[PDB]
Design a protein around this ligand. Structure first.
Ligand SMILES: CCC1=C(C)/C(=C/C2=NC(=C\c3[nH]c(/C=C4\NC(=O)[C@H](C)[C@H]4CC)c(C)c3CCC(=O)O)/C(CCC(=O)O)=C2C)NC1=O
Ligand SMILES: CCC1=C(C)/C(=C/C2=NC(=C\c3[nH]c(/C=C4\NC(=O)[C@H](C)[C@H]4CC)c(C)c3CCC(=O)O)/C(CCC(=O)O)=C2C)NC1=O
Ligand SMILES: CCC1=C(C)/C(=C/C2=NC(=C\c3[nH]c(/C=C4\NC(=O)[C@H](C)[C@H]4CC)c(C)c3CCC(=O)O)/C(CCC(=O)O)=C2C)NC1=O
Ligand SMILES: CCC1=C(C)/C(=C/C2=NC(=C\c3[nH]c(/C=C4\NC(=O)[C@H](C)[C@H]4CC)c(C)c3CCC(=O)O)/C(CCC(=O)O)=C2C)NC1=O
Ligand SMILES: CCC1=C(C)/C(=C/C2=NC(=C\c3[nH]c(/C=C4\NC(=O)[C@H](C)[C@H]4CC)c(C)c3CCC(=O)O)/C(CCC(=O)O)=C2C)NC1=O
Ligand SMILES: CCC1=C(C)/C(=C/C2=NC(=C\c3[nH]c(/C=C4\NC(=O)[C@H](C)[C@H]4CC)c(C)c3CCC(=O)O)/C(CCC(=O)O)=C2C)NC1=O
Ligand SMILES: CCC1=C(C)/C(=C/C2=NC(=C\c3[nH]c(/C=C4\NC(=O)[C@H](C)[C@H]4CC)c(C)c3CCC(=O)O)/C(CCC(=O)O)=C2C)NC1=O
Ligand SMILES: CCC1=C(C)/C(=C/C2=NC(=C\c3[nH]c(/C=C4\NC(=O)[C@H](C)[C@H]4CC)c(C)c3CCC(=O)O)/C(CCC(=O)O)=C2C)NC1=O
Ligand SMILES: CCC1=C(C)/C(=C/C2=NC(=C\c3[nH]c(/C=C4\NC(=O)[C@H](C)[C@H]4CC)c(C)c3CCC(=O)O)/C(CCC(=O)O)=C2C)NC1=O
Ligand SMILES: CCC1=C(C)/C(=C/C2=NC(=C\c3[nH]c(/C=C4\NC(=O)[C@H](C)[C@H]4CC)c(C)c3CCC(=O)O)/C(CCC(=O)O)=C2C)NC1=O
Lengths: 172, 162, 161, 48, 145, 68, 48, 160, 172, 160, 161, 161
């Protein structure tokens, strides 16, 4: 598994070199913003259930076919599987966010996922949408939390978004 | 889908033997029992409409506050999705009655029930009370072994929710 | 032509009667079997060529009929015969959809017995070709539709004999 | 074991290998993968 | 031309359905042959002379409405009747009207007509039988084969 | 569905003729797509010049709707 | 079964194999040929 | 019917029914019970429907029932309502068939020639039919009233 | 796994409605004929060994190449495998016959079977034939048993045949 | 479409649409979203479908892919699956149109002459289509699988 | 001809593309207006004759057009003119049902401008006859359908001018 | 149309000349090659389908022409194109038998260039289809007939360009 430092190290090694002063300071900056990062990961963990629930309510509000017989979130067994997948993806997105690298998300979650869903008959476009809704709400929470020191978290909100967007793209 | 026939066939397959007497004897039970089961099924089927409206209302009468604004028994969509859900239960009860086992209930309502209800803030108590009411009224639509069958499956749902 | 439904309408029209309970019961008896007729037609249509080939194989070829002196000798006549077979299959499928044999009389049987006598076409052999296609059809369409398809093949074959 | 197969395989892929390494056979059915994946979701890796 | 194709009895009832066709003929947009052809492709033709008869009388009726006679020999029934089995009415009609025989006999304008033919054997009496039957008088096939 | 509009001039090479006949020799008219073609042959196999052909009804590209 | 080439490890092999359908060579007319097979009433009797 | 129409087009092109043709037979037959209910309701109120069409007609055209009118008198009016009873009957037939084949052969092809001979004013027969639509339609649910209404407007159309 | 009732239920559910009095009575009839069905399954169980043995004797009577060296029922190991497969297929046919549905046969036994045999070099046409012989003898037994009440079992004999014919078709 | 077919029959008889014709347009359009979903699912799995059809085909006819076979070789097989991709596409078109007009002009009228020239065995193309039905049908609900299945069986029918 | 739906299918067929999101959105935009098109056609069809009569009354008759020297003088030509009017109304109803004007080009406009020049038929007067029928139609069909019916009358009239 | 024997007669008739020595020499030059023309026609006719297949394979298919956007895309147009090919082959065989190209003008080339421009049919691609059939023909018919068959294919192809 990689994190943002480990990634630097692998690229340096492929040159046969000690880390460039370029790469050093990029990593010094990651340490600089790490308290904000911890709050951002904490924002997701602290509202995981609601993020999934709210995404869910809204997914089925839009796509009332999934909860009809014939639909891929019917009966209870399938809805529980769908709720479970929402959690799994939100979980690996939070891991990537602590790590500063998408690899854990791509390697343990996204790799093969689309082909799984197609084999199953699970509508990937609906799954992509559920991921887009989790993103909206998750970032909502990253941006408006309990008595965190005021500052600018937009860099981290972007990065979180790209992890949500990776997952969506990979699946649709 | 868990049923008498299916279960015995599965047993045979696992054992890799042959449909012997034990199995045949067991299967006869399911066949002999079909008449009572299917009478319960027909009665529950044609009364479905009212059994559902009766139980839906009883959920509001037992939990009055549900029907106030800001609550989950308010507005057309909640009350619509409720009727539907009780209708799902009665539907699978009739299926379990016709099938000769709990399979339809196990596969389509029990597997996953709590996770779903917990994510969506649905209290089992409502559903138990819907079913307790349905059980009260089915006392006078059926009797004898058809009633016992209807009861078996209604109670199975109540225990499943608990 | 007429189908189940127009059979009833015309039977009442000549009496100038509005449709009554007995009429309405007949029409229901048709509508209630309708979906099954459609599925059966889609099986027959899509297996048309295979039904003819299996019916010919059981009831026509490998015989004196296909040998010199036989009526389905020559590529010309072999082609005419399986062409005919396709007519029968296709029209029986119409009759079964309509739930009325009247089309088999109007567009297939009328004059056909004598047409075959005039050309020398063997009638008994043609009936076997009809009853072999029925046999194949009844396997392909299943319990739902077997009896209903079958009758219009039987209509065809007692129309020639 | 964890490192080599679970960490970098999707669930589907990961589930295939336990059938190979542990029971010496391929998953007989589509449902068989469903059960395992689900059990992972509630009980976590060790239970699986 | 409604009495040649359609034949008299049912041409009495035509009122105005073919009226867009008539305008075109009147205005010299189509020739008499196009009009004749197009009135064989119409649903009235099809209803009257095709839907209630066996496919070999459809060929015979069509021979006498677009050509004047009856089928001459057997190598014809086979040709034209196996083009109706294969492709339906509009190909049968389209063929008769674009033949060499129609072109020689009728050309571009000349409404078709009953010719009492002299040669091949039996063409004359077969044709005269067809010609002198009112609509629905007898619907046997005269020339079965 | 498509129609061609064609001009044809066909002379009479056996017999002359005696009564007005002018529309039977040089004419124009809409002709259907399915024939226009086998009538293109009947005209040229009777020794007639075909003067001009125009599409009239359909679109040059096609693909769909043509078949009607 | 190892991942060193990419590191990630392959996408699950059996997803498409797992879901291939039943398939209905329906109708189906059996065959007696083969060799010529007895027909007649005599079969029982000869035996008797 | 829908069946007859589909088939006739099939046979005329020497072919089996299209997916489209099969679909409409399926949608049609699914509406069977509903169509039968629409015919029943109207059959059940036939005498009322003619009486209210007939009142609506004579207000709008008191002349038809006037000295030089085709329906002037008690028995020239009796035959007029009988004709209105005929057309309501044909409308019930059409609704259960899902097209006009039957309605057409029985009561529109030849109707111009018949009524011209009798010197009946055709467009006021069309009015009598609109009047029946209005009455019949008030005894049917919105959805069934529309489905019925198409067949009334057809007859009104054919007398034109 | 499905049986004939379970099948009904799955189709009903896909409509999102209850039994269509149509389906109810089809199933009432299955219960009506169930004693006969039990005798039919019992006919096979009670003669399983002979059904396999007799099919076998006859298969190798016809195809004497299988029992020569080079042949797929030679040496003892392969003959035992072939005898075992005959039993396995007869088993799943009897299960289908108790169930009133082919699914257990198709899902556990027939699914992939042809491709197995081709991989192995097992001549599928010979296997198909062994199945045809089991059918002849099995039905023989269904039709002429020990002191069963006299009646008409042709409906059940047909249905058993289609299970034998499914297997044959699937394999050849 | 259903629209084109209805209209062409209307215009050819010089008339407005029938109650029947109007009804089928209504039933058809009501199934719009469903038909669009059926096409989407199949479009979404096209590469898988075309491939499982191709395996089912080469087992059943290993000869086509044999010395004297039309599809013998890697690029004679590549073109063969491409043709299977073509027909699946046309099947999605047909399903959303509710009839075959488009399917027919694009890929059956002339198909005998095309494949006879290339010396492609037509009936094994029909098999490739059955194979696609089997795969596609396993990715659709019972009701949608049947609706799709009619269009697969049509193509199978037309290559005949 | 083509309609909304086949317009899209043929546009994609020439590119050999399966229908994508943009295509699917277009088809939805048609299906979602479909029921309203049907109702509008039933109003037009059943009021056909009254629409022509009110359109002629506002835009053609009581004029020099119907007087000696005018193109709709003589019962012959008056009949031809309102015959034409019926074509326009009827075809516009087809175009509006199809949601595509292609039929108005294929079966109505092609050559018509010159046909009218050759006979002397007044073009401007015919356009007014079209735009008067539109006016009547838009009242009868209501808010739901007014704009959609109207465009194919406007297609017809800019096709002549 | 005209052929070598007929052309000699009409070319002299317009001058009112008896056939003279120069004429008689021309006709001999035709008769003396006649048997070879017949043999060549029997080879072409009996290999017709294979010539088209090999000519299409070398000069038309496996290309953008047969792909979406191409003029021989769709079974409809592929069929129309090889239908055309058969015309060319068949008529060139007539021209070569007659020993005169006049039939290729009267019944094939007249208006064809513009017909192809109007439909969008690619001219250059069609010429290659002609010159590929010539290539195949020249192998099949042999030394005796190769040059004589070839010229009427070349007549066809410079008639389009
Ligand atoms: C690697 C991490 C991972 C992912 C992403 C994953 C996806 C996944 N989703 C599945 C099923 C499913 N997925 C859904 C999802 C949906 N249904 C809808 O209608 C919506 C559009 C959508 C929710 C937004 C449903 C309904 C099923 C059950 C399908 C069935 O059994 O019929 C299955 C089959 C196994 C099972 O049901 O447990 C897998 C493997 N599995 C994994 O291990
Ligand atoms: C238990 C693990 C752990 C956490 C969670 C942690 C959080 C943490 N967040 C901090 C700051 C902060 N955190 C934020 C975060 C935000 N500002 C906003 O306006 C947004 C709503 C939000 C975006 C994510 C900001 C702006 C600061 C002050 C600047 C900084 O220290 O970088 C600080 C520095 C002290 C302070 O200023 O309060 C700590 C220790 N430390 C830890 O050891
Ligand atoms: C196949 C078997 C099956 C069952 C049993 C089932 C239950 C079920 N009930 C749900 C929602 C619901 N269930 C209810 C229930 C009620 N509301 C009331 O007025 C009453 C208090 C009560 C009825 C007693 C409500 C209000 C919702 C909407 C919850 C939400 O989305 O906020 C949902 C979420 C998806 C949706 O919104 O439809 C499921 C899956 N789903 C199934 O597929
Ligand atoms: C005198 C006019 C005439 C001909 C030619 C004719 C042919 C003919 N060939 C047949 C079969 C057959 N013909 C062949 C021929 C071939 N298989 C191949 O792959 C090769 C391409 C070809 C050999 C060169 C085969 C294999 C069958 C058996 C097909 C079957 O039984 O399905 C049959 C059906 C069997 C029968 O009943 O006789 C007929 C009638 N019949 C006639 O009246
Ligand atoms: C199916 C599509 C179609 C159309 C639209 C059509 C129009 C059309 N209008 C025509 C004549 C005509 N059209 C009109 C029309 C009018 N007179 C007026 O003064 C008004 C301005 C206008 C009516 C609003 C008249 C008066 C004639 C007769 C000209 C003559 O006397 O020759 C003719 C000549 C043949 C005939 O007289 O019938 C055609 C073909 N033909 C078609 O096939
Ligand atoms: C649309 C309804 C319709 C039918 C059914 C029909 C039948 C029909 N079969 C014919 C001939 C024929 N029919 C057959 C049929 C057979 N030969 C045999 O030996 C078998 C017993 C049998 C096939 C199973 C043959 C061989 C001929 C040709 C007779 C001849 O050589 O003249 C002919 C004479 C014209 C022709 O040759 O096409 C007709 C009209 N025509 C119709 O319009
Ligand atoms: C231990 C499991 C078990 C079995 C096996 C069972 C068999 C059983 N078979 C029965 C009848 C029967 N069984 C058959 C069977 C046949 N008739 C024939 O002629 C064929 C040779 C054979 C075809 C399979 C028939 C015809 C009846 C009488 C009709 C009926 O009851 O349906 C009956 C009704 C009582 C009787 O009439 O004897 C029972 C209880 N019951 C059980 O609980
Ligand atoms: C020279 C050939 C020729 C004739 C005959 C002809 C008649 C004709 N009569 C008209 C109206 C009329 N014609 C009448 C006639 C009558 N009302 C009755 O009830 C009686 C039966 C009848 C008097 C005997 C009436 C009442 C109108 C007005 C109708 C209206 O405005 O709706 C109009 C429309 C008004 C106009 O623009 O002029 C025309 C064109 N036009 C012609 O080009
Ligand atoms: C959308 C309408 C449409 C279709 C369907 C179509 C098919 C088509 N198939 C072709 C070849 C081919 N098609 C196949 C197909 C097969 N081989 C077999 O044995 C099987 C029976 C079958 C696969 C299921 C093969 C093997 C070729 C190569 C033949 C050759 O090159 O001689 C070619 C020539 C190659 C090219 O230029 O593209 C065309 C145009 N073209 C069209 O415009
Ligand atoms: C008897 C003498 C004679 C000739 C030669 C003839 C040619 C001819 N080719 C046509 C079309 C065509 N011709 C082609 C030909 C080709 N497509 C290509 O891409 C290639 C370059 C080429 C084949 C090598 C095609 C594709 C069409 C159809 C155009 C359309 O879709 O409308 C048409 C239009 C009518 C129709 O579609 O049949 C004619 C008349 N007609 C005749 O009467």
């Amino acid at each position: 598994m990689q994190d943002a430092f480990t990634k630097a190290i692998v690229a340096a090694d492929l040159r046969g070199s000690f880390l460039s002063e370029q790469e050093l300071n990029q990593l010094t900056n990651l340490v600089k913003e790490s308290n904000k990062r911890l709050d951002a990961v904490n924002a997701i963990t602290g509202n995981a259930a609601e993020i999934i629930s709210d995404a869910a309510h809204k997914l089925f509000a839009e796509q009332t076919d999934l909860i009809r017989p014939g639909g891929n979130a019917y009966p209870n067994r399938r809805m529980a599987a769908c709720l479970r997948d929402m959690e799994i993806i939100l979980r690996y997105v939070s891991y990537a966010l602590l790590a500063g690298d998408a690899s854990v998300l791509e390697d343990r979650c996204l790799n093969g996922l689309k082909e799984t869903y197609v084999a199953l008959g699970t509508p990937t476009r609906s799954v992509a949408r559920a991921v887009q809704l989790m993103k909206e709400t998750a970032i909502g929470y990253v941006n408006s939390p309990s008595g965190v020191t005021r500052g600018d978290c937009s860099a981290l909100v972007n990065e979180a978004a790209t992890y949500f967007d990776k997952a969506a793209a990979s699946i649709a | 889908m868990k049923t008498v026939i299916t279960e015995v066939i599965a047993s045979a397959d696992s054992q890799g033997r042959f449909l012997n007497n034990t199995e045949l004897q067991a299967a006869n039970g399911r066949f002999q029992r079909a008449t009572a089961s299917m009478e319960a099924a027909r009665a529950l089927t044609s009364n479905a409409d009212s059994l559902v409206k009766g139980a839906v209302q009883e959920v509001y009468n037992k939990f009055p506050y549900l029907t106030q604004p800001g609550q989950m028994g308010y507005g057309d969509t909640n009350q619509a999705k409720c009727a539907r859900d009780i209708s799902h239960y009665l539907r699978f009860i009739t299926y379990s009655l016709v099938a000769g086992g709990t399979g339809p209930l196990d596969d389509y309502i029990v597997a996953g029930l709590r996770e779903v209800n917990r994510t969506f803030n649905l209290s089992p108590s409502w559903y138990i009370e819907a079913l307790k009411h349905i059980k009260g009224k089915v006392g006078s639509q059926l009797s004898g072994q058809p009633l016992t069958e209807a009861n078996a499956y209604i109670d199975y749902c109540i225990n499943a929710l608990s | 032509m007429q189908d189940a439904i127009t059979a009833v309408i015309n039977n009442y029209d000549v009496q100038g009667k509005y449709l009554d309970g007995a009429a309405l019961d007949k029409l229901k008896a048709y509508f209630t079997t309708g979906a099954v007729r459609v599925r059966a037609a889609a099986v027959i249509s899509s297996n048309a060529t295979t039904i003819i080939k299996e019916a010919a194989a059981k009831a026509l070829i490998y015989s004196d009929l296909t040998r010199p002196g036989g009526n389905m000798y020559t590529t010309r006549r072999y082609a005419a015969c399986i062409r005919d077979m396709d007519y029968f299959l296709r029209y029986a499928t119409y009759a079964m959809l309509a739930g009325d044999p009247s089309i088999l009389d109007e567009r297939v049987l009328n004059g056909l017995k004598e047409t075959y006598n005039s050309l020398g076409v063997p009638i008994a052999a043609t009936v076997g070709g009809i009853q072999a296609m029925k046999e194949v059809v009844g396997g392909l369409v299943g319990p739902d539709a077997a009896k209903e398809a079958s009758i219009y093949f039987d209509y065809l074959s007692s129309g020639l004999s | 074991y964890r490192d080599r197969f679970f960490r970098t395989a999707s669930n589907n892929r990961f589930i295939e290998l336990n059938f190979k390494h542990f029971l010496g056979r391929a998953p007989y059915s589509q449902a068989e993968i469903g059960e395992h994946f689900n059990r992972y979701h509630k009980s976590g890796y060790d239970a699986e | 031309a409604y009495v040649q194709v359609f034949d008299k009895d049912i041409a009495s009832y035509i009122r105005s359905e073919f009226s867009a066709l008539e305008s075109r003929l009147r205005n010299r947009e189509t020739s008499v042959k196009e009009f004749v052809r197009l009135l064989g492709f119409s649903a009235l033709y099809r209803k009257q002379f095709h839907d209630r008869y066996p496919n070999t009388k459809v060929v015979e009726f069509a021979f006498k409405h677009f050509l004047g006679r009856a089928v001459k020999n057997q190598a014809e029934l086979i040709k034209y009747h196996g083009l109706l089995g294969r492709k339906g009415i509009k190909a049968l009609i389209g063929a008769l009207v674009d033949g060499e025989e129609y072109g020689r006999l009728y050309g571009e304008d000349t409404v078709p007509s009953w010719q009492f033919p002299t040669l091949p054997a039996a063409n004359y009496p077969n044709s005269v039988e067809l010609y002198n039957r009112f609509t629905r008088q007898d619907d046997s096939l005269v020339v079965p084969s | 569905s498509r129609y061609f509009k064609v001009t044809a001039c066909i002379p009479s090479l056996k017999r002359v003729r005696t009564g007005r006949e002018l529309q039977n020799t040089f004419f124009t008219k809409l002709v259907p797509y399915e024939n226009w073609f086998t009538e293109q042959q009947r005209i040229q196999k009777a020794g007639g010049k075909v003067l001009s052909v125009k599409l009239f009804t359909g679109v040059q590209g096609a693909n769909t709707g043509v078949g009607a | 079964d190892t991942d060193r080439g990419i590191g990630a490890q392959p996408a699950a092999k059996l997803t498409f194999p797992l879901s291939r359908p039943l398939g209905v060579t329906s109708a189906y007319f059996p065959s007696s040929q083969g060799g010529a097979a007895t027909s007649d009433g005599l079969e029982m009797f000869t035996r008797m | 019917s829908v069946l007859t129409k589909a088939i006739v087009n099939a046979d005329a092109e020497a072919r089996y029914l299209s997916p489209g043709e099969l679909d409409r037979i399926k949608s049609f037959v699914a509406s069977g019970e509903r169509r039968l209910r629409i015919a029943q309701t109207l059959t059940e109120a036939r005498e009322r429907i003619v009486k209210q069409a007939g009142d609506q007609l004579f207000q709008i055209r008191p002349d038809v029932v006037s000295p030089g009118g085709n329906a002037y008198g008690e028995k020239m009016t009796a035959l007029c309502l009988r004709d209105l009873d005929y057309y309501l009957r044909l409308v019930t037939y059409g609704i259960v068939a899902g097209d006009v084949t039957p309605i057409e052969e029985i009561g529109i092809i030849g109707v111009k020639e018949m009524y011209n001979s009798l010197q009946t004013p055709i467009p006021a027969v069309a009015e009598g039919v609109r009047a029946m639509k209005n009455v019949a339609t008030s005894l049917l649910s919105g959805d069934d009233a529309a489905e019925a209404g198409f067949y009334f407007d057809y007859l009104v159309g054919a007398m034109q």
